[PDB]
Amino acid sequence: DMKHTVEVMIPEAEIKARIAELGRQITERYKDSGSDMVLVGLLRGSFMFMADLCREVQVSHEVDFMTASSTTRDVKILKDLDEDIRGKDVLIVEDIIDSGNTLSKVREILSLREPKSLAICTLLDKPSRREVNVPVEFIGFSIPDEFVVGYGIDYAQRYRHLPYIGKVILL
Amino acid sequence: DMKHTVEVMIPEAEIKARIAELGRQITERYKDSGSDMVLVGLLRGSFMFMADLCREVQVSHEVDFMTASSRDVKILKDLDEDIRGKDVLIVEDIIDSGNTLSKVREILSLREPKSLAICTLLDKPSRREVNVPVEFIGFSIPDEFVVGYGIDYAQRYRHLPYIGKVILL
Amino acid sequence: DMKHTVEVMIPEAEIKARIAELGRQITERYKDSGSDMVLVGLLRGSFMFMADLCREVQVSHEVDFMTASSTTRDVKILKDLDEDIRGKDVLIVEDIIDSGNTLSKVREILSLREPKSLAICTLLDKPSRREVNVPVEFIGFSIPDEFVVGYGIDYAQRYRHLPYIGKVILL
Amino acid sequence: DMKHTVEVMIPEAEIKARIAELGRQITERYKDSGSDMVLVGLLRGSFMFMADLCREVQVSHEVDFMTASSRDVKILKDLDEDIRGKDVLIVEDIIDSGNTLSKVREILSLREPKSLAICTLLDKPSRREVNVPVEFIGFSIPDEFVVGYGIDYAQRYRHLPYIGKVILL
Ligand SMILES: O=c1[nH]cnc2c1ncn2CCN(CCP(=O)(O)O)C[C@H](O)CO
Ligand SMILES: O=c1[nH]cnc2c1ncn2CCN(CCP(=O)(O)O)C[C@H](O)CO
Ligand SMILES: O=c1[nH]cnc2c1ncn2CCN(CCP(=O)(O)O)C[C@H](O)CO
Numbered sequence: 001d002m003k004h005t006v007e008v009m010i011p012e013a014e015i016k017a018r019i020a021e022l023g024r025q026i027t028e029r030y031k032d033s034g035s036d037m038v039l040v041g042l043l044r045g046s047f048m049f050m051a052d053l054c055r056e057v058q059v060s061h062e063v064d065f066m067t068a069s070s071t072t073r074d075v076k077i078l079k080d081l082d083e084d085i086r087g088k089d090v091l092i093v094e095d096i097i098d099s100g101n102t103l104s105k106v107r108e109i110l111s112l113r114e115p116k117s118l119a120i121c122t123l124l125d126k127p128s129r130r131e132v133n134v135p136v137e138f139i140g141f142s143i144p145d146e147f148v149v150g151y152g153i154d155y156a157q158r159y160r161h162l163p164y165i166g167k168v169i170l171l
Numbered sequence: 172d173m174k175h176t177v178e179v180m181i182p183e184a185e186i187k188a189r190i191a192e193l194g195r196q197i198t199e200r201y202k203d204s205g206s207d208m209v210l211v212g213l214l215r216g217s218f219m220f221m222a223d224l225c226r227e228v229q230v231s232h233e234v235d236f237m238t239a240s241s242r243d244v245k246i247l248k249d250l251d252e253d254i255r256g257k258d259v260l261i262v263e264d265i266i267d268s269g270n271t272l273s274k275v276r277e278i279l280s281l282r283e284p285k286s287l288a289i290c291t292l293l294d295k296p297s298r299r300e301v302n303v304p305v306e307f308i309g310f311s312i313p314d315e316f317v318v319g320y321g322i323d324y325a326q327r328y329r330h331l332p333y334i335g336k337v338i339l340l
Numbered sequence: 341d342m343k344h345t346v347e348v349m350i351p352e353a354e355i356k357a358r359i360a361e362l363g364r365q366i367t368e369r370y371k372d373s374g375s376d377m378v379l380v381g382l383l384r385g386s387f388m389f390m391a392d393l394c395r396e397v398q399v400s401h402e403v404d405f406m407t408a409s410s411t412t413r414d415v416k417i418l419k420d421l422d423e424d425i426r427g428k429d430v431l432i433v434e435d436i437i438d439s440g441n442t443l444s445k446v447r448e449i450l451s452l453r454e455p456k457s458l459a460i461c462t463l464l465d466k467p468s469r470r471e472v473n474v475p476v477e478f479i480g481f482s483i484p485d486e487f488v489v490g491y492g493i494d495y496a497q498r499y500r501h502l503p504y505i506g507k508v509i510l511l
Numbered sequence: 512d513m514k515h516t517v518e519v520m521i522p523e524a525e526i527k528a529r530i531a532e533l534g535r536q537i538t539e540r541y542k543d544s545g546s547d548m549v550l551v552g553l554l555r556g557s558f559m560f561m562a563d564l565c566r567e568v569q570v571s572h573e574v575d576f577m578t579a580s581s582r583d584v585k586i587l588k589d590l591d592e593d594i595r596g597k598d599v600l601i602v603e604d605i606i607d608s609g610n611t612l613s614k615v616r617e618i619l620s621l622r623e624p625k626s627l628a629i630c631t632l633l634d635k636p637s638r639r640e641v642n643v644p645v646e647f648i649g650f651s652i653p654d655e656f657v658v659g660y661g662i663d664y665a666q667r668y669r670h671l672p673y674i675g676k677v678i679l680l
């Protein structure tokens with residue numbers, strides 16, 4: 001709770017263009033698989049991104065969601081997937097990776113169910129903060145070490161509905 | 172699950188146009204409230220609708236989600252945030268019989284929000300078993316079986332950008 | 341986290357005797373109903389109490405569990421019942437009621453599903469702290485305004501496994 | 512769900528006797544560890560067993576619960592507390608095929624507890640599809656269909672104080 005402003009870091013039209021590209025790449029990757037495919041979103045930050053991305057993926061797939069939450073602390077499953085991923089191409093859709101702990105542990109958890117394949121697509125990557133090295137196949141934007149909001153991403157529950165990515169500026 | 176096909180019924184552009192109008196209406200009804208606002212989506216069907224709709228709502232608000240299932244309506248995943256004293260708009264993909272939004276409205280009512288309204292993308296008005304008040308409606312449609320824009324048929328077609336009609340063979 | 345001791349308030353043999361009585365009363369109440377009956381425990385404090393009580397209930401019933409958690413704050417369902425209670429005699433089994441808010445809201449939530457009947461059985465009642473008046477049909481012990489542990493009830497996660505009820509004494 | 516009857520197989524007193532021995536064994540194995548201990552029950556079947564067993568364990572520990580379900584093993588309700596760096600004893604009503612405790616052990620393993628052991632009330636050794644290590648066993652039994660002491664038959668008989676055998680007609 002600090003006096004702040006929001007400033008545009010990635011305008012809406014840039015996000016739209018990037019998601020279109022991610023879309024084409026993802027499609028190219030899975031179009032020939034033949035196995036069932038599911039996009040798994042991590043809630044609730046990733047709802048907007050998932051919504052726009054899955055519309056740009058020209059491959060028949062399912063959409064499902066999982067809610068996880070973690071001074072370390074264990075990553076625990078508040079809400080598991082509705083569907084089985086065994087034998088399917090799974091794509092994990094996340095809003096932001098910075099430390100990597102969360103994606104890292106979630107990938108481990110999902111791998112136990114033996115999907116045909118397992119990959120991650122994150123809209124924003126903040127590598128300056130990476131602690132655990134985790135392989136991310138698809139990245140929309142690598143960004144500077146700034147606290148961003150919008151496009152599903154909140155600051156203290158606020159700003160998820162902004163159609164662009166922006167940064168919180170203090171004082 | 173039978174052999175079939177999918178035809179466009181509501182093009183992407185018409186949805187986008189309608190959602191913009193819903194945006195203005197919702198903004199208008201809540202612009203002056205002052206209290207905190209939250210849109211609550213019912214997963215999974217409402218996620219896409221929610222994504223486009225909240226972007227058209229020009230009032231500061233929070234976004235939350237809930238997963239309910241039957242039989243008696245049971246909560247698989249409750250809201251993350253409190254809604255007490257707040258303007259709450261439930262966002263849903265379809266109302267048909269009315270059973271779901273009926274029981275969800277009851278449950279959330281107990282938390283004593285400032286206000287409680289419903290916004291549904293699709294209304295099938297016929298076959299209404301329990302009559303629930305819905306303030307905002309995207310489209311009223313006949314008793315057609317549709318898929319797309321979040322709505323599945325046996326887990327398929329959720330990612331279509333249009334509403335489509337399943338055609339059996 | 342304070343230096344403390346535990347002292348016996350209700351010895352194990354007293355709890356056993358009381359649960360036996362509660363058992364007989366509950367049995368008397370529902371033996372003629374004919375409708376299905378379910379005992380609903382509130383987790384996780386009530387697991388021990390449920391375990392012992394349901395063994396003293398001579399009526400065919402189901403056992404199910406719910407996990408709820410609440411500066412007020414909303415009572416939210418972390419884990420709902422597995423079974424439907426519509427048309428059944430439902431007995432809510434709780435370890436302690438002191439303020440009453442929790443039982444109060446949980447009863448409201450469960451009533452919406454239209455059980456044949458709805459009642460509460462709590463092992464410990466701390467009425468000096470009652471804020472909301474909530475009707476409790478079955479009570480094991482009304483107790484003084486002391487912080488108790490044991491018999492499923494924790495102090496900072498500690499002491500659930502004690503076979504008796506005791507009080508935490510500071511310094 | 513067919514017409515049937517229920518006969519005692521393991522009387523209440525024999526269970527109580529066995530659980531006391533399990534108590535001494537578990538206490539012995541963990542008395543000197545120093546690290547924090549937690550018993551983790553898998554709901555619903557294990558709640559009664561857990562209630563009697565934890566009372567016989569003479570080492571400070573926490574009690575936690577987990578609800579899993581299938582197919583792929585999915586978590587309906589995760590633990591409330593962290594188990595990292597702790598001695599964790601999974602408490603379960605029955606191991607048969609081994610699939611359940613297998614996947615649950617994997618999942619919990621990822622949280623990197625100090626140690627990870629299993630205590631099961633009943634072992635049906637036959638029909639073991641995946642071989643999982645179980646440190647503590649109440650009773651090994653034939654491939655009989657039993658109910659009671661937490662164990663249901665179509666949601667019935669969980670509250671019996673003995674283990675019983677269902678007899679079909
Ligand atoms: O700039 C930010 N805005 C808002 N949230 C952030 C930001 N930077 C990290 N977070 C937390 C995002 N994650 C942590 C990702 P990890 O460290 O495990 O790689 C928390 C959830 O994804 C919530 O979005
Ligand atoms: O054409 C359809 N496609 C896909 N789902 C449908 C359709 N017609 C009714 N449904 C079911 C919608 N359910 C039930 C609504 P209720 O009858 O309770 O008013 C809504 C659920 O949230 C699933 O989206
Ligand atoms: O002496 C106590 N020991 C341990 N926990 C307590 C005590 N007194 C109240 N609590 C909290 C118990 N409840 C609150 C009951 P409410 O105020 O809603 O009537 C919390 C859960 O039941 C956890 O057991």
Ligand SMILES: O=c1[nH]cnc2c1ncn2CCN(CCP(=O)(O)O)C[C@H](O)CO
Pocket residue numbers: 553556604605606607608609610611612655656657658662663
């Ligand atoms: O006689 C029985 N009564 C009641 N349930 C049984 C019985 N025999 C196997 N089961 C199923 C026990 N499940 C599966 C154990 P797995 O085959 O995975 O090793 C255990 C679940 O936790 C349900 O209690």
Ligand SMILES: [Mg+2]
Pocket residue numbers: 216322323
């Ligand atoms: Mg559906």
Ligand SMILES: [Mg+2]
Pocket residue numbers: 556662663
């Ligand atoms: Mg069972």
